Paper text:
In eukaryotes, the endoplasmic reticulum (ER) is the central organelle for the synthesis of proteins destined for secretion and membrane insertion. To ensure that the environment for productive protein maturation is maintained, both folding capacity and the inward flux of newly synthesised proteins are regulated by a pervasive negative feedback signalling pathway, the unfolded protein response ([name]). [name], conserved in all eukaryotes and therefore the best-studied [name] transducer, detects ER stress via its luminal domain (IRE1LD), initiating dimerisation-dependent autophosphorylation of its cytosolic domain. An alternative hypothesis posits that [name] is repressed by interacting with a major component of the ER folding machinery, the heat-shock protein (Hsp70) chaperone [name].
Residue numbers in the entry:
A (entry chain A), B (entry chain A): 29 to 85, 91 to 132, 148 to 308, 356 to 368
């Protein structure tokens, strides 16, 4: 279990992946990360599955509070008539690493954050969302770890990469876009920081990495965390998932549009607020 | 509504009391403040309705975290196998001050904190409790306010008292022991700090206050917040409510025992940890 690596996706598919191989050992399919039906009626707030932040489209920008932070603080009342009301259930899961059942198993706990906004001025609720998240510790810059992660936004492509050199460990494709990584630490989950990159850009990198790997025939090269950050332009990616609009940070390469109900128009990359 | 005063009790009876009179204008009966059935099985943690703190009886002492703080932080896992799992629903209530119904009404919001502990070593849950609380702002030392409050622990007796002089404004009796006071501020609730005193002691004060009021025939005198604090000894009161044990701070006068399943023995006042 210390060898395995947990991977969380937008459709609620937690995959237990062997870090070295990059393939899936077993998977847990449960409730999906972001479910926002109020955006169907009026889209105003834009959640972020990576941690739980919220953005507002009045133009696109980031808010000071996450959905979890807004749920715990709630109930409250705004200057505007709208009042906030949250709910935060805690579910746990236990399944044998092989699968009074078998002992020394793995106990995983997650959350159901659920925020709701009702405008006092109006006669109807003005927003609503349901955000899940796995309970795990904070990321630290551990020297024991020798990997890093690049994940496409809007597509389930993962590129695992040696921490120091950047040489590709494994590129893999999961059904739904990945949102978070967790490795087993202190008999529990510890979140692993990753780097969101544009799917177009990420695919573009993966091909050239194979091209340089073929021509040189020495090592398939992939950039380090800092190199991409300096080289690639930042962008705020907007996406959709089953009639639910979300936002996230992202990196684009040259030749990609980035902005400074028509769902699709707002979808894509925007300039970092 | 700015004239009225909200009063919360252990049986979930929020009373809207006129501050000057001290009598009840209307009441809202809902779910009670503290419901702890796990203490029935094993009593370990002792909640406090005044704000939500927890005490442990291994001897009697206070914990660093409240039930709300423990609910929001949860889920988690302790060094001992036991894992924590919380739930925090947010309910609101609107009733006309007279009672698309009548406008300019009062919207009151409360919470259902619900914490649970299950020992991994054991095969059964080790604790469980459900604590309510009304959503309201913090108390400030406002000069506009000219009152203070003494409440008995384990009995529903309230002694309202002029802030400066200490002269009794009104002594009143409510069915269930009061837990919190809220006054309408900024079109919302603002918590009002009160002073918990032993019922025996409080009754003792109320009689002598009437005695000095009769003999002198000038003013029924009651002590100020500081005088009682200096004069009266502190004690940690333990009580019960429908097979649920709780604890709270309290003040005792001379001639009252204070300690340095037999439910009843632990009930009463103990030395401040």
């Amino acid at each position: 279990p210390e060898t395995l690596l947990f991977v969380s996706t937008l459709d609620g598919s937690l995959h237990a992946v062997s870090k070295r191989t990059g393939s899936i050992k077993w998977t847990l399919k449960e409730d999906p990360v972001l479910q926002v039906p109020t955006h169907v009626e009026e889209p105003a707030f834009l959640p972020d599955p990576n941690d739980g932040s919220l953005y507002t489209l009045e133009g696109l920008t980031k808010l000071p509070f996450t959905i979890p932070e807004l749920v715990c603080a709630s109930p409250s009342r705004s200057s505007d008539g709208i009042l906030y009301m949250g709910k935060k259930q805690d579910i746990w899961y236990v399944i044998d690493l092989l699968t009074s059942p078998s002992t020394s198993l793995l106990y995983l706990g997650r959350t159901e954050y659920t925020i709701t906004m009702y405008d006092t001025k109006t006669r109807e609720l003005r927003w609503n969302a349901t955000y899940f998240d796995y309970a795990a510790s904070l990321p630290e810059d551990d020297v024991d770890y020798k990997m890093s992660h690049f994940v496409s936004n809007g597509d389930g492509l993962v590129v695992t990469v040696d921490s120091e050199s950047g040489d590709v460990l494994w590129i893999q494709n999961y059904a739904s876009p990945v949102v978070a990584f967790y490795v087993w630490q202190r008999e529990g989950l510890r979140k692993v920081m990753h780097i969101n990159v544009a799917v177009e850009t990420l695919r573009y990198l993966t091909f050239m990495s194979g091209e340089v790997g073929r021509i040189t025939k020495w090592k398939y090269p992939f950039p380090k965390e800092t190199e991409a950050k300096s080289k690639l332009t930042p962008t705020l990616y907007v996406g959709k998932y089953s009639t639910s609009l979300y936002a996230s940070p992202s990196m684009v390469h040259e030749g990609v549009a980035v902005v400074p109900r028509n769902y699709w128009l707002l979808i894509g990359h925007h300039e970092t607020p």
